[PDB]
């Protein structure tokens, strides 16, 4: 029955030590509903909790979608019917969680961010683009068009702020670049644009690795090698 902020964040800490992410997500719901700007640690907790809760359902969704695609060839009405119903159930669950997340960012986090809180607004725009991407991953048609437009607008804003005030080796900006490129490659189906953006971010972070502190250095790398893997995967299947 603990309500205050400290008990909430400590409950979130226990949850992340307990591998129970739903309670963590509720705790961050309440912490953000306290309408106070979030520090780095609470922000990280909110991010990881909601990332896990969306990732579980996303894994369930792509598994079920692959099963549906395989079973569609055989053509049995009942199995396709129940598969479609279960996929719709998972889709509704994803839509509920993502709508909660985006309502939270629109109503609480971006609103109380000052004009000088550049990193906070970029980070929030970052997950909002990510979660609109998650919506699009199950959306088709006009709803898909609306969500991709929303995610593109959010991503362009986030990229512009990132360019204007972050230095390129900041891990937040690199993660934004990775998720933007994933959006371009997977949703926009424009691998050239994603490759160009990823290579630009890669070269820019090369430009500054000379004068990076080791604490920031490994933070830069542990995103950089993944970025380079994404580039190599995208550049290994060109026109042949």
């Amino acid at each position: 029955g603990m309500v205050d902020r400290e008990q909430l964040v400590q409950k979130a800490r226990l949850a992340e030590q307990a591998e129970r992410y739903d309670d963590m997500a509720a705790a961050m719901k309440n912490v953000t509903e306290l309408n106070e700007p979030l520090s780095n640690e609470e922000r990280n907790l909110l991010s990881v909790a909601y990332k896990n809760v969306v990732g579980a359902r996303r894994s369930s969704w792509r598994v079920i979608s692959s099963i549906e695609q395989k079973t569609s060839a055989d053509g049995n009405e009942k199995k396709i019917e129940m598969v479609r119903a279960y996929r719709e159930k998972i889709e509704k669950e994803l839509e509920a969680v993502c709508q909660d997340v985006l309502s939270l960012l629109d109503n609480y986090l971006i609103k109380n961010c000052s004009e000088t809180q550049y990193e906070s607004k970029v980070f929030y725009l970052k997950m909002k683009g990510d979660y609109y991407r998650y919506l699009a991953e199950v959306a088709t048609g006009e709803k898909r068009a609306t969500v991709v437009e929303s995610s593109e607008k959010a991503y362009s804003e986030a990229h512009e702020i990132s360019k204007e005030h972050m230095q390129p080796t900041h891990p937040i900006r690199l993660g934004l670049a990775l998720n933007y490129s994933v959006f371009y490659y997977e949703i926009q189906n424009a691998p050239e644009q994603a490759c160009h953006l990823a290579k630009t971010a890669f070269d820019d972070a090369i430009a500054e690795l000379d004068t990076l502190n080791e604490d920031s250095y490994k933070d830069s790398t542990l995103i950089m090698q993944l970025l380079r893997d994404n580039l190599t995967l995208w550049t290994s299947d060109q026109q042949d």
Binding site: E16, N40, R43, N44, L45, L46, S47, V48, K51, N52, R62, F123, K126, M127, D130, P171, I172, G175, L178, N179, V182, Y185, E186, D219, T221, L222, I223, M224, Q225, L226, R228, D229, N230, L233
Partner: protein
């Protein structure tokens, strides 16, 4: 899925039980063989019984191996055409002399008989027909006296292995070809011995006592004279103008006359081994043996090979091994590339050989490159080695005269810190030797990687740290022991490093204890200060230089070795590249090295690189690892000073946030370290493939407390490995080498104690490879204990083999008996035993050497012999008892005798003998001294679990002495049978032999073992009866010999293109290529081998590429080109493009392949729908086709012996069918034809102009039939015309000549809407050949009356499944016990009855076709009485047995659509059926030819497969239990 990251997740980044883990699973016959039956007498067949008249035409008999005595005179006169009289091992006493009275007899073989002392020939017989008078291995005392006056045409008189002592007759015989006096006791030969034989070519006298040749005739070709007592070769051999080979081994000669004393231009093979030759004169005329190909000079006292040996370019197999004083190969033999074998046994050269290649052809290339330009090489290794800290870095930094020494306090050495420093000596010698200094790691943490870097060519140093004098030197003994263990002949210079600090009496202890007791050759010592330059430093420098220059391992002077200048240039380019390689990743890929060698003007190829890189590795520039297990041959490590520095990083720093693993055990974790300089993990796993690190280094040095389940001193057996000091690289490498030891399941409990394993499976079996130190004994012991149970014996055998292999591989210094002094050998491998069973209170030592010396008995006893202990319970490694218990020797029942050489018959002068075992004849193999006990058990442990029916299977093996027992190949190796018993080959047994070897190859490949050596010499046969379960067998000894000691290069004649070149690694595709070569040879029946024996270099260089000639064109044999397509698939140069063994076996497994003789691809874009065979001219039958590509008629003559297709336009309208009518009179066969215009056209066989069309018939002709009606009491024939109206224009045999033949009985059966399209004939002749034809849909028949006998309707069916399948025009009809009817586009065949006229059966093609994967009936053809064939509209053939079972087999994947279906007979291979299918990719009518004999075979072979599978699955229970 793309890598998406939550940056929050980025910021965020005990077992205690083991309960249930949800496993939740999921024409008289000729050859009769009477050899195997024990016949004491053959007098039963000599009488006048029912078989006495049939024997007259035998021509072939085998009465060998039985116990006949005194062959009856009646039988030899019974038959008068016998020409292959073969019988040996019969218990006769004297030659009958009555066995030569028949008319024409040759091949008279008596090869083992106990013929009397004299074999005098009765002069009352004058038979010259004898061609082989084989008198092998008799008790003869004198050559048959009446050979001259009785047998005149004798060619092969073989009397080897006899006791003919006195000088023989002048031998007035004129027709000899080959003479053999081998293994006789001869004093000499008379001057008129061979003066009356001007035709001999292969005289061979072996194992005799002869002195000189008595005027050998110029006719000689082959002379074998090894094993004699000489002093020089007499001139009578030296003047033979046609001598081709000379075997002179096991002799005592002194001088070989040079080229100007042989007077021959065709010397090829020169065997002069085991003799005493001092000079090899070749200077006078080097080109005079330009065609010599073989030259064996082994076990001789050769001084040096003259430079003129570069001229005999034909030399192929050179042997100068066992010389022990050669020490040099001239650079001139590098021009002589034809060598494929060059043994290098027991001789030392100016270079190190046999690293991983050196397969006797890279040696030639090395010598040639050295001939190009030879320059001295000056690169030594100075491996400074210390302990925990000494004057190593401080002494090396001042030995190098490094003035700077910027680091005022240099930290501890990590890795080896490889450095190179030049020394230009300011003296007379300009030689500027440069040598690398490797200051190894003092600290004991790194001690498990150093042995990798201790090469036999080095000048080691060790450093005292004299401050702790007389005590620290005691701790340095392990280092010198390791130096001896790694490089026995490597000088060591110990140096003191501390004179400013304080104890100089260390010289006394060094000279007293450390000098020369089981330690390396300490050549000098010094007491340098190692702090500032002084006269001591100058003396140390002078000593180090003087010792480097006088290294002389094997007296060779390594400091000035000679190599090709290409080596120097490549060393220079890699040195230049060293400063241009990324610091973060100094490894160079193979492509980079190739680009580097391309940039400059180097002269090596892709094949000179492997030896170049290894020599340069031996001289410390770049480390490359060519071992296939370490999949890092692509990587090349330039500037190793980085690689060692990185490999030693892990041993120094280990960090864990939580102790998730015990100390010494590390989970697989990656550390980025350098970023983006490509990052590659193969070196990360190399860190484990080095066996460096699970890190055995720093792994629980104290042993955990461990208690054995049983320690009653009787059920356990112990072995001890007392050695002075455990080498550094021993315990970690032993622990990793043990890996897993499998008692012949569930993985054991594995414990990893720094020196110890103790892996166990149960209280029944365990293995404690411990390390304990006994009190009052400074030495270190490796105690190993296992239970006495059988699994324990297997475990002990495997671990003792592994530890001995490790010691033989990495530490040759220890296991080397030092003759100087005494045989201490530094490894006193003890064996502990106790007479008192339990509570013996003492374990008694006994050296393993003396125990293995006690192999004369099986039981070991002390001086008090009443109580005894079995050896096999004290050391199951000496007794071959660790292997499965079904392979014991059991010498009691082994009826064996090594001494006789007539039991050596298996193989010519081979080591495989013949003896009796368990009551049956077996082929025993005697092992020589070459194979050691470890090697033999390594071979037999892998040979003890092959067990495959078409493979030789080990039956017994044991000691006293060392042999091996395998199954006896009664027919021997396949090469002999394909070279002189081709008549036994009859176009079918080739298939079975190929099947059996293919099964063996497939089984071996499934076991991940490839034969790598598969020749007709390796196919051991057992029977020649084709319908046998076990026929062919491939020797499994080749793979054992390959894997035991690593003929891996293979025979040059039968070798894959990728193996002889040696550039690419080998695979199963080489075995596939060799199998295709076996197919080619077995098709040629030893035709290629004969051509290759006289031209070996071309025999190899022609088959090295895929350009083998057409077997049918070059060699007279049956074409059978289907298997030629299989060969071309297996002859492909691309390895992966060749089919795998499983696929070729399966396509061979089909019974249709032997039957399908061939396939003819008729030229592009032609359509044909009719065909007729020719049977009367059975000598050669050509095939006549029609035309469908043109609306007009065009006859298509096609031959079969020439495959020559011709086109001739003959009709204005397309011809739909043909027929052959033959007239016994006038000897001709007219060819009639029918077209859509009704123009019945007749054409002569041999005349293309005598064409006269018959009456123009109103409609389109659909069928033409030639029949057999002899109703006029004489040979008569008619003709039948199937047309589109049912009008039968029946003609006569002889009336077709006249223009417009008058029909006999015009029978209009059908209507305009009911046409006629098919005819057939009765299957039997007792019904006067009732003929059944199909008009429209109903079936109808006549007889000689030519009236409609039946009007059976098929549309009115009461089992309607579909209408049009029965309501359509007929297509085919066959006359048998039942009637099979197929309609147009009808995939269902109807079975009608002749009498009851009812649908007895309804067989649907799809009812079987849909079970294996369009598809409908296209054509039909029935056999005589056994099988039916349905021609599917696709590329599937179904075999229909009309008797009991419908489906026999579906043959698909050969074509795409089957258009015609009919039989024929061709060229003495009668009764062959023909198909013409399509293979669309454009219509290609693939005419394909299939013999019809198989209805028995198609089921007999599968009966040979079902019986194959059962024993391929039955006696695998031996592997289980």
């Amino acid at each position: 899925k793309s890598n998406s990251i939550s940056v929050g997740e980025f910021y965020r980044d005990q077992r205690h039980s083991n309960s249930l883990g949800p496993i939740f699973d999921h024409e008289y016959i000729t050859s009769l063989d009477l050899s195997a039956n024990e016949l004491r007498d053959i007098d039963a067949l000599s009488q006048k019984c029912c078989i006495s008249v049939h024997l007259e035409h035998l021509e072939k008999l085998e009465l060998h191996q039985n116990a006949l005595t005194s062959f009856p005179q009646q039988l030899c006169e019974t038959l008068k055409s016998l020409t292959h009289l073969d019988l040996h091992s019969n218990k006769f006493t004297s030659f009958p002399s009555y066995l030569l009275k028949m008319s024409c007899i040759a091949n008279l073989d008596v090869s083992r008989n106990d013929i009397g002392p004299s074999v005098v020939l009765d002069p009352t017989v004058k038979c010259p027909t004898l061609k082989q008078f084989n008198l092998s291995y008799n008790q003869l005392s004198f050559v048959p006296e009446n050979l001259t006056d009785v047998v005149e045409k004798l060619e092969q008189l073989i009397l080897e292995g006899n006791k003919i002592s006195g000088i023989c007759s002048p031998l007035r015989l004129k027709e000899l070809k080959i003479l053999n006096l081998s293994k006789n006791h001869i004093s000499s030969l008379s001057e008129n011995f061979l003066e009356a034989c001007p035709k001999v070519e292969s005289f061979s006298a072996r194992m005799n006592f002869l002195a000189a040749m008595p005027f050998l005739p110029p006719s000689m070709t082959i002379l074998k004279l090894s094993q004699n007592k000489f002093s020089c070769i007499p001139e009578a051999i030296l003047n033979l103008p046609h001598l081709r080979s000379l075997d002179m081994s096991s002799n005592d000669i002194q001088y070989l006359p040079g080229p100007a004393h042989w007077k021959s231009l065709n010397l090829r093979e020169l065997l002069f081994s085991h003799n005493q030759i001092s000079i090899l004169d070749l200077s006078e005329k080097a080109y005079l043996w330009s065609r010599v190909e073989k030259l064996h000079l082994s076990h001789n006292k050769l001084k040096e090979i003259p430079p003129e040996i570069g001229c005999l370019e034909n030399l192929t197999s050179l042997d100068v091994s066992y010389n022990l004083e050669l020490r040099s190969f001239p650079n001139e033999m590098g021009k002589l590339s034809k060598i494929w074998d060059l043994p290098l046994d027991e001789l030392h050269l100016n270079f190190d050989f046999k690293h991983i290649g050196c397969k006797a052809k890279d040696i030639i290339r090395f010598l040639q490159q050295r001939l190009k330009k030879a320059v001295p090489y000056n690169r030594m290794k100075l491996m400074i080695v210390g302990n925990t800290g000494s004057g190593k870095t401080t002494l090396l930094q001042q030995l190098m005269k490094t003035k700077k020494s910027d680091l005022g306090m240099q930290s501890a050495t990590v890795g080896i810190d490889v450095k190179d420093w030049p020394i230009q000596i300011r003296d007379k010698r300009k030689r500027d030797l440069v040598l690398n200094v490797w200051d190894f790691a003092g600290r004991e943490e790194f001690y498990s990687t150093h042995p990798h870097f201790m090469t036999q060519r080095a000048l080691y140093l060790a450093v005292y740290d004299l401050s702790k004098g007389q005590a620290e030197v005691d701790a340095m003994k392990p280092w010198l022991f390791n130096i001896k263990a790694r490089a026995s002949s490597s000088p060591v210079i110990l140096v003191g490093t501390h004179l400013d600090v304080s104890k100089a009496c260390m010289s006394k202890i060094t000279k007293e204890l450390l000098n020369k007791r089981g330690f390396p050759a300490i050549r000098d010592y010094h007491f340098v200060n190692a702090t500032e330059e002084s006269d001591a430093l100058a003396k140390l420098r002078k000593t180090i230089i003087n010792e480097s220059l006088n290294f002389k391992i094997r007296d060779q002077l390594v400091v000035g070795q000679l190599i090709p200048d290409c080596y120097v240039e490549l060393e220079k380019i890699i040195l230049s590249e060293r400063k241009n390689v990324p610091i973060e990743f100094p490894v160079i890929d193979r492509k980079r090295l190739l680009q580097l060698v391309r940039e400059n003007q180097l002269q090596l190829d892709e094949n000179e690189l492997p030896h170049a890189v290894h020599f340069l590795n031996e001289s410390g520039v770049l480390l490359h690892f060519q071992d296939p297990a370490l999949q890092l041959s692509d990587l090349y490590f330039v500037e190793p000073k980085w690689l060692c520095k990185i490999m030693a990083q892990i041993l120094t720093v280990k960090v864990e946030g939580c102790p998730k693993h015990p100390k010494g055990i590390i989970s697989r974790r990656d550390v980025e370290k350098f970023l983006s300089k490509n990052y590659m993990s193969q070196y990360f796993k190399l860190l484990e493939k080095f066996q460096i690190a699970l890190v055995p280094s720093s792994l629980s040095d104290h042993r955990p407390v461990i208690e054995l389940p049983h320690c009653e001193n009787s059920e356990i057996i112990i072995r001890l490995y007392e050695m002075p000091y455990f080498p550094m690289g021993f315990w970690s490498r032993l622990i990793n080498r043990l890996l897993e030891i499998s008692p012949y399941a569930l993985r054991p409990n594995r414990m990893y104690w720094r020196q110890g394993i103790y892996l166990n499976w149960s209280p029944e079996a365990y293995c404690l490879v411990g390390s304990e130190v006994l009190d009052n004994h400074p030495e270190s012991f490796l105690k190993i204990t296992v239970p006495s149970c059988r699994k324990g014996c297997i475990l002990l055998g495997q671990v003792v083999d592994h530890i001995d292999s490790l010691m033989e591989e990495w530490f040759p210094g220890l296991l080397e008996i030092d003759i100087c002094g005494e045989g201490e050998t530094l490894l006193k491998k003890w064996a502990l035993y106790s007479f008192n069973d339990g509570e013996e209170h003492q374990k008694i030592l006994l050296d393993d050497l003396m125990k293995k010396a006690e192999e004369g008995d099986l039981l070991v006893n002390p001086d008090q012999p009443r109580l005894t202990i079995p050896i096999s319970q004290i050391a199951p490694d000496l007794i071959l008892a660790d292997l499965p218990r079904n392979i014991m020797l059991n010498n009691d029942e082994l009826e064996f005798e090594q001494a006789p050489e007539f039991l050596l018959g298996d193989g010519s002068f081979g080591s495989v003998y013949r003896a009796a075992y368990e009551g049956e004849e077996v082929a025993v193999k005697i092992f020589n001294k070459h194979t050691s006990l470890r090697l033999l058990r390594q071979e037999l442990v892998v040979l003890c679990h092959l067990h495959h029916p078409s493979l030789i299977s080990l039956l017994a093996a044991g000691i006293r002495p060392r042999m091996l027992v395998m199954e006896l190949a009664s027919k021997g190796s396949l090469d002999r049978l394909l070279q002189q018993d081709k008549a036994s080959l009859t176009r079918t047994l080739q298939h079975r032999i190929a099947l059996h070897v293919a099964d063996g190859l497939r089984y071996l490949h499934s076991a991940m073992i490839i034969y790598r050596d598969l020749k007709p010499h390796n196919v051991l046969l057992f029977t020649l009866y084709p319908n046998a379960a076990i026929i062919a067998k491939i020797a499994d000894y080749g793979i054992a010999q390959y894997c035991c000691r690593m003929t891996s290069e293979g025979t040059p004649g039968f070798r894959a293109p990728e193996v002889a070149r040696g550039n690419v690694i080998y695979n199963q595709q080489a075995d596939v290529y060799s199998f295709g070569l076996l197919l080619y040879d077995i098709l040629t029946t030893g035709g290629r081998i004969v051509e290759g024996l006289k031209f070996p270099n071309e025999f190899d260089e022609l088959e090295i590429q895929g350009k083998l000639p057409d077997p049918v064109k070059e060699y007279g044999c049956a074409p059978w080109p289907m298997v030629e397509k299989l060969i071309k698939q297996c002859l492909k140069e691309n390895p992966q493009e060749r089919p795998t063994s499983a696929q070729v076996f399966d396509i061979l497994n089909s019974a249709e392949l032997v039957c399908l003789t061939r396939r003819i691809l008729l030229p592009k874009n032609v359509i044909v729908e009719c065909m007729v065979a020719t049977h009367h001219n059975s000598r050669n039958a050509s095939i006549w086709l029609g035309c469908g590509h043109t609306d007009r008629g065009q006859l298509s003559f096609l031959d079969l012996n020439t495959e020559g297709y011709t086109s001739e336009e003959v009709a204005d309208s397309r011809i739909l069918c043909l027929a052959l009518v033959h007239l016994p009179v006038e000897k001709e066969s007219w060819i009639v034809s029918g077209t859509q215009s009704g123009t019945l056209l007749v054409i002569n066989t041999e005349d293309g102009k005598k064409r006269h069309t018959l009456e123009k018939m109103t409609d389109s002709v659909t069928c033409l039939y030639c029949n057999s009606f002899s109703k006029q009491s004489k040979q008569k024939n008619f003709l039948l015309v199937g047309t589109a109206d049912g009008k039968l224009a029946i003609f006569e045999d002889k009336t077709v000549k006249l223009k417009g033949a008058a029909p006999l009985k015009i029978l209009n059966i059908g209507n305009v809407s009911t046409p006629l399209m098919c005819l057939s004939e009765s299957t039997n002749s007792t019904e006067r050949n009732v003929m059944w034809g199909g008009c429209g849909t109903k079936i109808f028949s006549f007889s000689n009356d030519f009236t409609i006998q039946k009007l059976i309707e098929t549309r009115t069916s009461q089992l309607f499944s579909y209408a049009a399948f029965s309501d359509s025009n007929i297509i085919t009809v066959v006359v048998d016990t039942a009637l099979y009817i197929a309609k147009q586009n009808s995939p269902v065949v109807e079975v009608w009855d002749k009498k009851t006229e009812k649908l007895c059966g309804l067989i649907d093609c799809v009812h079987f076709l849909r079970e294996v994967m369009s598809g409908r009936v296209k054509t039909l053809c029935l056999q005589k009485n056994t099988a039916l064939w349905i021609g599917t509209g696709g590329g599937h053939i179904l075999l229909l047995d009309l008797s009991t079972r419908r489906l026999i087999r579906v043959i698909y994947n050969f074509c795409n659509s089957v258009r015609v279906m009919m039989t024929a007979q061709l060229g003495s291979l009668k009764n062959v059926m023909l198909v013409l299918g399509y293979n669309r990719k454009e219509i290609q009518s693939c005419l394909t030819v299939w013999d019809i004999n198989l209805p028995h075979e198609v089921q007999n072979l599968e009966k040979h497969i079902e019986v194959r599978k059962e024993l391929a699955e039955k006696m695998r229970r031996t592997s289980v239990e």
